[PDB]
Amino acid sequence: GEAPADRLKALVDAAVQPVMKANDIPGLAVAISLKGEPHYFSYGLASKEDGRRVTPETLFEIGSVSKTFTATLAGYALTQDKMRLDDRASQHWPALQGSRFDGISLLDLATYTAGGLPLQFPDSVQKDQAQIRDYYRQWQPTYAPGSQRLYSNPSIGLFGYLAARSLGQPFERLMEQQVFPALGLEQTHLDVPEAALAQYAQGYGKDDRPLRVGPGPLDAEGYGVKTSAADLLRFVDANLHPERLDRPWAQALDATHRGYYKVGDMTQGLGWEAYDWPISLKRLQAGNSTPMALQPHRIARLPAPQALEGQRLLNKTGSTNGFGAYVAFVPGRDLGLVILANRNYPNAERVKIAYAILSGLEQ
Ligand SMILES: *[B@@]([O])(O[C][C][O])C1=[C][C]=[C][C]=[C]1
Ligand SMILES: [Cl-]
């Protein structure tokens, strides 16, 4: 019958449309993996000015969802014995020898517990090897490594950069030549080809100023990925089924499904952040709130790494000045979703769309 497809469209429309109107989102793509099948729902405009509609192939900036790709490359380095999570950071970049990175682990960098590395590089640090070098050489922790989580692009960016160093190639090259092809991703880019630019959505800010992400230090590692809803769902499906990949990449994905500590309801993995499932919408919003991004929190370390599988929701938000993304999946239910928009709209609203969809699929 047509009832299931009609029901799914009705559910996704009912979840998405009021939130798009309420946050004046010009265009939004949803992709859902359900019972081993992909489903796409596209809304609105990729560009208000030329009238290009969103499709499942439209490219959006995914911001910090890029950190899950960065974690997958690090997973590869780790499970190939090129690095270990307890290595000191300076083991992998001689320029950092003699700095405070002699006493900071790769795990600390990956999980934002190095001791107060900030949300962003200061404006004074441009996309320049020497300026990035000099930034880290001069940095000092605010509190003991391993004690407080402070969400940080310089932190996990350095983790990614060191993972690439451990593999002997530039991060950007490894992603394009190895990681994206291993995951089967042909619509996923750090640097969108000229031939694909027609697919790149416009981003919109205050007063609808047009905003696409510019170059910045460790941009590739932290927030560099542009992808389509269809490709990002393929990446979600790889996370749901790492066993469908060749074993070296399966292991790499598995390494991003291990939790190291808790803050409140959230368990921190490499890239991914996990919750018990089910949990209330308000608790999931709290985990994805502004204070979780901007303020330090004392961690509760786990006695050993915890498998992030079964009845858990793994998620990540991502933002750039013009874009807002959210990905969530439930390993034990073989369920995944992607929500990509061309406005940076509040995380709570992203989570509200996802939760309405997940609730509807349950009920
Ligand atoms: B990233 O998009 O994280 C915010 C949404 O969780 C991000 C963080 C810091 C700098 C650039 C991008
Ligand atoms: Cl930054």
Q: Which helix (H) or strand (E) holds 136?
A: helix 129-138
3-state helix, strand, coil in the chain (%, to 5): 45, 20, 35
Beta carbon of 79 within 6 Å of any ligand 1 atom: no
Report the distance separating Cα 221 and Cα 193, nearest Å. 19
Nearest residue to 63 (alpha-carbon basis) of 334, 322, 351, 363 = 322
Does any ligand 1 atom lie closer than 6 A to the CB of residue 224? Answer: no
Task: Give me the amino acid identity at 250.
Answer: A
In 3D space, the residue among 221, 227, 304 whose CA is nearest the CA of residue 62 turns out to be 227
Cα distance between residue 114 and residue 109, in whole Å: 6
Closest ligand to the CA of 320: 1
* CA 298 to centroid of ligand 2, rounded, Å: 23
Name the β-bridge partners of 325.
Answer: 318, 340
What is the rounded CA–CA span in Å between residue 283 and residue 265?
Answer: 7
* 178 within ligand 1 shell (Cβ under 6 A): no
Contact by Cβ (8 Å): 272, 328 = no
Atom number of ligand 1 nearest to Cα 119: 9
- Cβ neighbours of residue 19 under 8 Å, at least 6 residues apart? 25, 345, 349, 352, 353
Contact by Cβ (8 Å): 233, 336: yes
User: Residue type for 22, please?
Assistant: A
C-alpha span between 135 and 223 (Å, rounded): 19
| Location of structure tokens 């939760």 | 355
CB atoms within 10 A of CB 291: 9
Tell me how far the alpha carbon of residue 323 lies from the centroid of ligand 1, in angstroms: 11
Tell me whether residue 355 is one of the annotated catalytic residues: no
Asked if 255 and 77 touch (Cβ cutoff 8 Å), the reply is no
Alpha-carbon distance values, 351 to 260, 278, 289 (Å): 24, 14, 10
b/e map of 161-172 (b: 16 or more CB within 10 Å)?
Answer: bbbbbbbeeebe
The residues, any chain, with a CB within 8 Å of residue 278's CB and separated by 6 or more, are 311, 362
* Candidates 43, 112, 135, 151; catalytic one: 151
Residue type at 262? K
Within 10 angstroms of residue 311's Cβ, the number of other Cβ atoms is 11
Experimentally determined by: X-ray
Cα of 38 vs centre of ligand 2, distance in Å, is: 33
**CA 31-36-42 angle, 5° bins:** 15
Domain 1-363: which CATH number of 3.40.710.10, 3.40.50.1100, 3.30.420.40, 3.40.50.300: 3.40.710.10
Asked if 172 contacts 99 with a C-beta cutoff of 8 angstroms, the reply is no
The answer to whether the CB of 203 falls within 8 A of the CB of 211 is: yes
How many CA atoms does the CB half-sphere of 65 hold within 13 Å? 34
Residue partners of 121: CB distance under 8 A and separation at least 6:
132, 135, 153, 154, 216, 217, 218
